[PDB]
Amino acid sequence: GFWEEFESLQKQEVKNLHQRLEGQRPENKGKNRYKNILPFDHSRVILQGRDSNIPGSDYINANYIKNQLLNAKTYIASQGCLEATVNDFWQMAWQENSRVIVMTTREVPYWPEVGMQRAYGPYSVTNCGEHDTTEYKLRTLQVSPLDNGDLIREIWHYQYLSWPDHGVPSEPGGVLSFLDQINQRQESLPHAGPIIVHSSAGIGRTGTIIVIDMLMENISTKGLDCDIDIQKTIQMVRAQRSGMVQTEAQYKFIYVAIAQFIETTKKKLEV
């Protein structure tokens, strides 16, 4: 009954076991969209090339996320940029060798318009084209260090357009198609660093997208015959960034999406 359930939930606490010192530093206050949504120190992304004598200079609100129930894909779960952290975001993308960025919100932009080139700190970003579907945009970005134009990286920016405010999509087909494109892209780049995924707080839509993708990967890799434990998968990612999958609606969407993924996959096999 109550005490058994309570005891179980207490077993799942992580914020008591993992500190969030860096994100709470006063010097980093302007770098968090929400003062109470912060990265665990242990898995945070540390920005390189910064001066430790500038308090907080290495900080970004983002964590590495791995499928740790297990060569699976790796991720970074990041909060969406503030005006003050756009350069930090590009520093993260560059240093991590990320070639795929997944943005789950509609429009602070951090890319130029098609055919245009802009500087973000030490980096140049060029928008080499945009291609749309009914639910998302794909922008092809080319990034280089400002001082070295001979060094160019193609970065594929996927922006989902139709996720409802304060809810989830009514059907999961759009997200499943979106993730299929993302997976194929990442798989085509064996040396690529983690896929960066972001949303306003970097936990709700972000955790939902990441968990669905990890489950699709488990299914593709281990088979339709494999055990799917969504609750366990969610807890495993929450130990890496607090609050991943934040709402009842998101939680239910994961089940709805994976159920449809399985059923469609099966139907295709049996045609």
Side-chain angles (χ1 to χ4, degrees):
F2 172 81
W3 287 108
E4 184 172 340
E5 298 158 15
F6 171 83
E7 159 185 46
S8 301
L9 283 165
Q10 289 296 351
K11 294 191 196 97
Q12 288 179 334
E13 281 298 291
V14 288
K15 61 175 185 53
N16 295 339
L17 297 192
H18 297 302
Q19 286 187 280
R20 296 165 299 151
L21 281 189
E22 300 297 325
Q24 301 179 291
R25 301 191 180 271
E27 48 267 48
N28 293 324
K29 199 163 182 284
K31 299 177 191 174
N32 301 316
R33 178 172 283 100
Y34 309 104
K35 84 178 69 171
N36 293 313
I37 299 173
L38 301 172
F40 286 135
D41 289 338
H42 80 85
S43 53
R44 77 188 181 101
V45 182
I46 301 175
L47 301 179
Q48 303 176 353
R50 297 291 171 96
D51 181 2
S52 59
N53 287 332
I54 299 300
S57 64
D58 76 8
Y59 179 81
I60 189 166
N61 195 323
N63 298 91
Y64 301 112
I65 314 289
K66 308 260 194 312
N67 192 331
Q68 280 176 351
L69 297 178
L70 312 184
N71 56 11
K73 301 185 298 300
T74 61
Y75 314 82
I76 286 168
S78 181
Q79 66 162 31
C81 293
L82 302 162
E83 308 95 276
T85 69
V86 171
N87 298 341
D88 295 338
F89 181 90
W90 280 115
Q91 172 58 42
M92 172 173 68
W94 187 266
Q95 79 184 34
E96 303 295 332
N97 195 35
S98 294
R99 302 298 176 108
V100 182
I101 299 174
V102 181
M103 166 171 186
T104 63
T105 53
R106 294 188 295 272
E107 307 183 55
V108 172
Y110 49 90
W111 56 85
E113 293 302 296
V114 172
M116 313 301 295
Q117 178 183 19
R118 293 236 306 109
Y120 303 90
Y123 304 102
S124 167
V125 177
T126 300
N127 182 339
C128 294
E130 173 183 341
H131 302 265
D132 292 19
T133 73
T134 58
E135 296 125 357
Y136 71 85
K137 298 180 179 186
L138 172 58
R139 293 177 175 90
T140 300
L141 303 183
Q142 284 182 12
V143 187
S144 57
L146 279 175
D147 56 27
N148 191 4
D150 299 326
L151 199 50
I152 297 164
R153 293 184 185 171
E154 287 194 293
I155 290 179
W156 306 86
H157 184 259
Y158 288 86
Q159 174 180 25
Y160 206 78
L161 300 178
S162 62
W163 199 297
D165 302 317
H166 277 240
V168 298
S170 47
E171 304 295 345
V175 170
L176 294 169
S177 170
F178 181 64
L179 289 177
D180 174 65
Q181 296 292 337
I182 287 157
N183 296 161
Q184 289 186 24
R185 182 75 61 183
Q186 179 77 357
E187 296 170 35
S188 79
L189 303 166
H191 298 309
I195 301 173
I196 291 165
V197 182
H198 74 79
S199 53
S200 189
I203 56 172
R205 303 185 189 185
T206 293
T208 304
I209 282 284
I210 288 174
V211 167
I212 291 170
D213 196 74
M214 285 181 172
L215 296 168
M216 294 168 62
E217 176 151 13
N218 294 344
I219 295 168
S220 304
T221 295
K222 306 191 176 305
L224 265 48
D225 211 318
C226 80
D227 202 46
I228 295 297
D229 195 330
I230 287 170
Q231 288 177 289
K232 178 195 280 277
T233 300
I234 289 176
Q235 282 311 129
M236 174 275 297
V237 303
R238 286 175 178 173
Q240 297 174 78
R241 183 166 168 88
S242 192
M244 296 277 280
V245 187
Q246 192 54 213
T247 69
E248 158 222 71
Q250 287 159 4
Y251 178 77
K252 286 168 179 176
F253 186 73
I254 295 176
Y255 278 81
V256 171
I258 292 307
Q260 180 158 313
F261 182 67
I262 289 169
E263 299 198 49
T264 300
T265 301
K266 294 188 294 188
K267 290 183 300 180
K268 292 186 175 162
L269 300 174
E270 307 175 21
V271 57

